[PDB]
Amino acid sequence: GSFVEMVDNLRGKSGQGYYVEMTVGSPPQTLNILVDTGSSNFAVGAAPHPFLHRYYQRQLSSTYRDLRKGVYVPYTQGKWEGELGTDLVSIPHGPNVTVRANIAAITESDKFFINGSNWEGILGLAYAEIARPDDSLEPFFDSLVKQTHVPNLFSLQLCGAGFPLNQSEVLASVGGSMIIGGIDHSLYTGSLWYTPIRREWYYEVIIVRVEINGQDLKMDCKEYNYDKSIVDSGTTNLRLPKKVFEAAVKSIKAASSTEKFPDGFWLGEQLVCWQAGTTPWNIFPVISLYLMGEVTNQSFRITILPQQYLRPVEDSQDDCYKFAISQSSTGTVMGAVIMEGFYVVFDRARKRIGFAVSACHVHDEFRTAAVEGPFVTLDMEDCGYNI
Numbered sequence: 001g002s003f004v005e006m007v008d009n010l011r012g013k014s015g016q017g018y019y020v021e022m023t024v025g026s027p028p029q030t031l032n033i034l035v036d037t038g039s040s041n042f043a044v045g046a047a048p049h050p051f052l053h054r055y056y057q058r059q060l061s062s063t064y065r066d067l068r069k070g071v072y073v074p075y076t077q078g079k080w081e082g083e084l085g086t087d088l089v090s091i092p093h094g095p096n097v098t099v100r101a102n103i104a105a106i107t108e109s110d111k112f113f114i115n116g117s118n119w120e121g122i123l124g125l126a127y128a129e130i131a132r133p134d135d136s137l138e139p140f141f142d143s144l145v146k147q148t149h150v151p152n153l154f155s156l157q158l159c160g161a162g163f164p165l166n167q168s169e170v171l172a173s174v175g176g177s178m179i180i181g182g183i184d185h186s187l188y189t190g191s192l193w194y195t196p197i198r199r200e201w202y203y204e205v206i207i208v209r210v211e212i213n214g215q216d217l218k219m220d221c222k223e224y225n226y227d228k229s230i231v232d233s234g235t236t237n238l239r240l241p242k243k244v245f246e247a248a249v250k251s252i253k254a255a256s257s258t259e260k261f262p263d264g265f266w267l268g269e270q271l272v273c274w275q276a277g278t279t280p281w282n283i284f285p286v287i288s289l290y291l292m293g294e295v296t297n298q299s300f301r302i303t304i305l306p307q308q309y310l311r312p313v314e315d316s317q318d319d320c321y322k323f324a325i326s327q328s329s330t331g332t333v334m335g336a337v338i339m340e341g342f343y344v345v346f347d348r349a350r351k352r353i354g355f356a357v358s359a360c361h362v363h364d365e366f367r368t369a370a371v372e373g374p375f376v377t378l379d380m381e382d383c384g385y386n387i
């Protein structure tokens with residue numbers, strides 16, 4: 001329905017992450033926390049770091065409980081290490097509940113904290129299977145549902161501004177909404193379409209067709225989900241498996257061939273700039289991903305514009321962007337590129353993910369993002385990868 005207390009509770013941007021205010025401990029210690037649907041731990045800075053102006057002080061919380069266990073989390077781009085404990089946690093612009101949750105108190109880290117991101121921890125919203133050290137460490141959302149009457153669902157509206165936000169503007173701007181326990185109808189237009197959650201670890205889905213300006217990429221659909229396809233608010237880009245990225249970039253270059261861009265642009269390294277207001281959106285194609293539907297032999301599609309996959313960056317008065325589609329060796333990742341176009345419903349109770357056109361997506365007067373269906377699609381289970 002309507003969850004006015006939670007609408008507009010996020011801040012941030014796709015390159016640095018979207019975060020929500022949380023409190024930990026007694027008396028409450030306020031921290032800004034990255035919303036990550038690609039991990040399952042609640043972890044906060046708990047020791048001084050050059051990029052943190054605040055951190056969780058366990059000795060100041062009367063409700064802190066030490067679990068006497070360490071946790072080491074190396075990942076591809078960085079790492080964090082900490083000490084496990086539990087404490088009382090609340091979300092000020094959230095459900096009006098306080099829960100006892102696991103917290104990893106980060107004591108050491110490498111390339112985890114981002115200079116100027118304004119966040120001090122991470123809220124992993126995925127399932128216990130991928131929690132560290134193991135699946136016995138109950139994730140935050142599981143605790144919240146177990147201890148309260150909050151429904152087992154959350155929804156995210158990540159709002160890209162469509163232009164660069166400076167240090168002061170990004171602190172003052174609304175970055176979106178995280179609706180805990182419900183769906184807010186003001187955040188989307190048109191209908192919500194649902195895709196099954198294939199398996200409960202990451203938010204895994206199955207892509208059954210890909211089009212660039214309506215032209216079928218025509219790959220075996222297993223390639224689109226090799227080795228998985230996930231929905232991840234903690235990734236900036238739309239990331240595609242190597243072979244799919246090579247085919248997609250060839251098609252996007254062919255569609256936009258009236259302008260030549262350097263190799264560095266297509267590699268997501270180099271910015272491209274145009275005179276203020278003259279970005280040639282129309283030369284870039286729309287991209288459609290068809291997802292397995294809830295009904296047998298039915299699919300639906302989500303369509304994004306270049307206003308989603310060209311990420312605004314500061315250079316001058318030019319309008320500059322980086323290409324936000326990149327290669328992956330770990331499957332498709334529908335990152336903040338995809339998510340900024342849509343309101344996304346993580347319906348854990350019904351094992352499904354819903355998509356609807358976001359009320360805050362960036363577009364122009366000629367094209368809009370879309371969520372449409374149904375389409376007849378056969379042998380969709382064959383699109384999922386095994387082993």
Ligand SMILES: CNc1nc(N2C[C@H]3C(=O)N(C)C(=N)N[C@@]3(c3ccc(C#N)s3)C2)nc(C)c1F
Pocket residue numbers: 016017034036037038039040041073075076077112124130131132232233234235
């Ligand atoms: C691999 N298993 C685990 N992986 C992770 N992460 C993988 C990181 C990543 O690479 N992406 C993309 C992501 N979605 N989440 C992470 C972020 C770190 C900083 C971010 C920012 N800004 S996002 C955390 N955490 C735990 C606790 C695991 F167990």
